[PDB]
């Protein structure tokens, strides 16, 4: 007796019956899977073997120290890069597999039961926040939301000045960026034209800034029973036909954030350690003095950006140029108006089975490259004395061997020890290479009991941009000037 109740004598479960929805509900509840393992991905996992490198650039000598780092993110927020993604609407059903991890999700588009949404809008009434969509799709949900928006803007609603939020990192690897911003980021990074090669060779430094402006978010309350999102026309076999199982379970978009997003690239050829500070000052719109080190950095900074939402169409703009246009990028989407509903920039998913928020674990190993720059310099000599003079100029040229060991190669001015006469001038180019610079200058007095007189003798001379050593005067009273020009 107990076997037959709530069942058809045919033994079949009729399509469009309450029995069908019940079977679907039990079918999803019966699923046993590991939530974390299904949403976990590993990046590269590099090994810690690195040697110190030295390289000569046209204007400077760089010392590069490579190091393996680890970046691991564990978030439920999924960044949106697609423009008009029909799949990414509130309450949409997504399949849990590789495609969900890659942010190119598989939409489960079956007959949907009505769903109730709430929207958090600054200056929106309590019970006017709810929306009842009878047949959830991208269109029906988008329409219901925009209808509420249009009403909310035309009725009243202050032009809410939207807060700007941003997170930033120093670029190193494309994989590392993907862990930080999402695995769909590769499209954006290619638009930003990030020069990873020049970073690794220490020729330039990159910082990536992600701006977010959330106008509003649409949310879905917890689903009581897994089968409550399906119409009775949906059967268990229908789900299996589309490959739904405990191994490929279901998830629903529990909320979507709407507004404007900006991925910013700050590309500087500087090797300074004040780069992060200079970039920050730029973002804050802080005035920069011309003779500062920051101004040197910012003048040599190329800026590219991808705009998602705000201003014109929904389409993504790829603006390019100098530092001057960063300020307007930030101010552009400051106000949320009737002109633009705003578009999805972020969404979150919850498992259909138990409404637990789906959290994605991503990690990767990357090489953190440090670069230390030593500027080239020139050593200038001027001989305007009434005497024969000799120079003894000597230095070491620094290099690094294939084992990263430090190497000092002795060097000497080819005209050392030679008798030089006024008016003699010369310029000796010295690379950042140079350590332990020593200059000795002596003069022939003509006196039999003391033929030579030292006019100048310094060791460990700093490699400034321009050092001019000028000698003049007489055999008995020689004069010397050690003039340094190293101002920025």
Numbering used by the authors: -17 to 470
From the paper:
Gram-positive bacteria, including the common wound-infecting Staphylococcus aureus, the virulent food-borne pathogen Listeria monocytogenes, and Streptococcus pneumoniae that causes pneumonia, utilize cholesterol-dependent cytolysins (CDCs) to attack and kill mammalian and human cells. The bacteria produce and release CDCs as water-soluble monomers that attach to cholesterol-containing cell membranes, where they assemble into large, 200–500 Å cytolytic pores. X-ray structures of pneumolysin (PLY) from S. pneumoniae show that the soluble toxin monomers are roughly rod-shaped and consist of four domains (D1-D4). Sequence comparison suggests that all CDCs have the same domain structure and therefore insert into target membranes in essentially the same way.
We also deleted Ala146 and Arg147 (PLYΔ146/147) in the loop that would clash with the last β-strand of the central β-sheet. X-ray data were collected to 2.45 and 2.5 Å resolution from crystals of PLYD168A and PLYΔ146/147. Superposition of both structures on PLYWT showed no significant overall differences, although a detailed comparison indicated small changes in domain D2, helix bundle HB2 and in two of the D4 loops. Around the mutated residue in PLYD168A differences were restricted to sidechain orientations, while the deletion of two residues in PLYΔ146/147 caused significant conformational changes in the loop connecting helix α5 to strand β7 of the central β-sheet. In PLYΔ146/147, one loop connecting D1 to D3 is also slightly different (red arrows). (A) Ala146 and Arg147 in the loop that induces refolding of the last β-strand in the central D3 β-sheet into helix α13a in the late prepore and pore complex. Deletion of both residues renders the toxin inactive. Even though the structures of PLYD168A and PLYΔ146/147 were very similar to PLYWT, they displayed major differences in their membrane-binding and oligomerization behaviour. PLYΔ146/147 was not able to bind to the membranes at all and had no detectable hemolytic activity. The pivotal role of the loop that contains residues 145–147 connecting helix α5 of D1 to β7 of β-hairpin one is underlined by mutant PLYΔ146/147 that was completely inactive and did not even bind to liposomes.
